[PDB]
Amino acid sequence: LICVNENGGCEQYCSDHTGTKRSCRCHEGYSLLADGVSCTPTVEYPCGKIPILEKRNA
Amino acid sequence: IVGGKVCPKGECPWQVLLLVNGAQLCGGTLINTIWVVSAAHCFDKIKNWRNLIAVLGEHDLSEHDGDEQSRRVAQVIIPSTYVPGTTNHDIALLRLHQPVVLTDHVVPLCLPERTFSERTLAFVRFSLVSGWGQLLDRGATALELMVLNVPRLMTQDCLQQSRPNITEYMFCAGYSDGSKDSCKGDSGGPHATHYRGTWYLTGIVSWGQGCATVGHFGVYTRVSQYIEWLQKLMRSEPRPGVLLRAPFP
Ligand SMILES: Nc1ccc(NC(=O)c2cnn(-c3ccccc3)c2O)cn1
Ligand SMILES: [Ca+2]
Ligand SMILES: [Cl-]
Ligand SMILES: [Cl-]
Ligand SMILES: [Cl-]
């Protein structure tokens, strides 16, 4: 996969590596799931999420 | 904001209100508990830096509901390339004197990595711009926070569809029919972009031919050009004297 196309399949950040390699990463306050692409919050108020809406849908 | 709607309380939780001697100056965006991004031009006329206050968790300026958090501004950092009274490099990084406390009403917007912002976010068509600025050109400012969804234009398209000096440090977004735009009083506020369930900072309200002027679009600072400049400054120690001009790049 490649970061320039469809964000390399990453939910957040993407780095290309030597070869057909790609590593996704997550912002602080999130951790990367075992799928290697998804990011899940690790704190109560992660950046870029709206608490009243996250709870409205929780 | 012209032609938008009230942002329901708590739905724009990264929005900052900047005050000087208690009067509305500009907006800003919280990016972590002690750092706010705003526009450099907001500070062109400041005489007493000690009279600058940032408010988080604000919504209706007519009342105090207890979710607001005010802080003094310890540092205002502007790129060396910004020239007062002009438009290019219109960005400022503000360090708060004490962190804000994150709550349901105060949450930072994510400052994205440059690659992600350039490769992915720059292609998301619509983004939200918000503020307590004028509701109309030559009109009164808003008492409740307003928000507007605006579509981004590639610069070649903006120039073609306009009737402007748009540099690589800016981008156009909005409408040319005079119905919807950010306006005076919104400068410094966020242009926020949603991608896969999370919102990111892509622009700063900067300038425009008047507000919602037919034939012209809103101009925003292209935050992606400043990610590394911002990250380096956030790792640095504060310096005496509020204003700091920092080399750019
Ligand atoms: N689309 C769009 C957005 C924003 C604006 N801004 C203005 O018109 C304006 C005019 N004076 N100031 C100012 C000067 C010094 C300190 C603080 C503010 C502004 O911010 C125009 N068009
Ligand atoms: Ca209030
Ligand atoms: Cl304080
Ligand atoms: Cl240092
Ligand atoms: Cl000072």
Residue B171 CA to residue B5 CA, distance in Å, equals 23
Determination technique for this PDB entry? X-ray
Q: How many CB pairs under 8 A join A and B?
A: 64
- Whether B150 lines ligand 1, by a CB cut-off of 6 Å, is no
State how far the Cα of B128 lies from the Cα of A50, in Å rounded to an integer.
Answer: 14
B104 assigned to a ligand binding site: no
- Enclosing H/E stretch for B171: strand B170-173
What single-letter amino acid sits at B53?
A: I
Q: Where are the alpha helices (DSSP H) in chain B?
A: 114-119, 155-161, 227-234
Rounded distance between C-alpha atoms, residue B101 and residue B83, angstroms: 34
CATH number at residue A29: 2.10.25.10
How far is Cα B198 from Cα A38, in angstroms, rounded to an integer?
Answer: 12
Which residues have C-beta within 8 Å of that of residue B92, sequence separation ≥ 6? B37, B38, B39, B40, B42, B43, B76, B77, B78, B188
8 A C-beta contact, residue B208 and residue B216: yes
Question: What is the phi/psi pair of residue B226, to 5°?
Answer: -115, 5
Under CATH, which number does the domain B1-12+109-224 receive? 2.40.10.10
B121 DSSP 8-state letter = G
Within 8 A of B8 by CB-CB distance, chain A residues are: 52
Rounded CA-CA distance B112/B51 in Å is: 31
Catalytic residue list contains B186: no
- Resolution, angstroms, 1 dp: 1.4
With H, G, I as helix, E, B as strand and everything else as coil, classify residue B32.
strand
Other beta carbons within 10 angstroms of residue A8's beta carbon come to: 21
**Rounded CA separation B74/B118 (Å):** 31
Cα dihedral sign, B232-A1-B191-B128 = negative
Tokens of B24: 């509305």
Q: Distance, in angstroms, between A45 CA and closest chain B CA?
A: 6
In whole angstroms, give the CA distance from residue A48 to residue B199.
4
Q: Which two tokens stand for residue B229?
A: 């400049």
* Distance (Å) from CA B27 to ligand 2 centroid: 15
To the nearest whole Å, the CA of B104 is away from the closest chain A CA by 5
**Alpha helices (H) in A1-58, listed in sequence order:** 51-56
Report the alpha-carbon angle B214-B217-B218, nearest 5.
125
Distance from C-alpha of B111 to C-alpha of B101, rounded to nearest angstrom: 18
Catalytic residue selected from B176, B187, B206, B224? B187
User: Residues in chain A, how many?
Assistant: 58
First to last CA, chain A: 32
Q: Let me know: does B177 contact B3? Beta carbons within 8 Å.
A: no
Distance of residue B83 Cα from the nearest chain A Cα, in angstroms: 31
> B194 catalytic, yes or no?
no
Contacts of B240 (CB under 8 A, 6+ apart): none
Sign of CA dihedral B188, B203, B240, B96: positive
- Pairwise CA distance, residues B111 & B69, whole Å: 21
Residue from A31, A50, A53, A54 whose CB has the most chain B CBs within 10 Å, to mutate? A50
CA of A51 to the centre of ligand 2 (A): 19
**What homologous superfamily does CATH list for B13-108+225-238?**
Trypsin-like serine proteases (2.40.10.10)
Angle at alpha carbon of residue A33, lines to A30 and A39, rounded to 5°: 35
Count other Cβ atoms within 10 Å, centred on residue B247. 9
Q: Kindly give the distance from the C-alpha atom of residue A5 to the centroid of ligand 3, in angstroms, as a whole number.
A: 44
Give nearest CA residue, ligand 1 atom 13. B42
**Of the candidates B98, B144, B148, the residue with the CA atom closest to the CA atom of residue B127:** B148
Q: What is the 3-class SS of A31-45, one letter each residue?
A: EECCCCCCEEECCCC
Dihedrals phi, psi of B51, to nearest 5 degrees: -105, 20
Spatial CA neighbour of A52 closest among B209, B249, B57, B157: B57
Q: Identify the domain containing residue A3 by its residue range.
A: 1-58
Give SS3 for B122: helix
Tokens of B112: 């994205």
Distances from the Cα of A3 to the Cαs of B102, B113, B119, B235, in angstroms? 32, 12, 8, 27
Quick one: which H or E segment has residue A23? Answer: strand A21-25
Q: Do A52 and B10 touch (CB under 8 A)?
A: yes
Domain with CATH 2.40.10.10 in chain B: 1-12+109-224, 13-108+225-238
Does any ligand 1 atom lie closer than 6 A to the CB of residue B16?
no
Q: Tally Cβ neighbours within 10 Å of residue B69.
A: 19
CA of residue A38 to ligand 3 center, whole Å:
37
User: Is B221 touching ligand 1 by the criterion CB < 6 Å?
Assistant: no
Write down how long chain B is.
Answer: 249
Count of domains in chain A?
1
B216 noted as active-site residue? no
Which of B82-104 are b and which e, b meaning 16 or more Cβ less than 10 Å from the residue's Cβ? beeeebbbbbbbbbbeeebebbb
d(Cα A58, Cα A50) in Å, to the nearest integer?
Answer: 12
Tell me the two tokens of residue B115: 């690659």
| CB-side neighbour CA atoms (13 Å) of B227 | 13
Q: Which ligand is nearest to the CA of B237?
A: 4
Q: Is the CB of B86 under 6 A from ligand 1?
A: no
Q: Give me Rg for the CA atoms of chain B.
A: 16
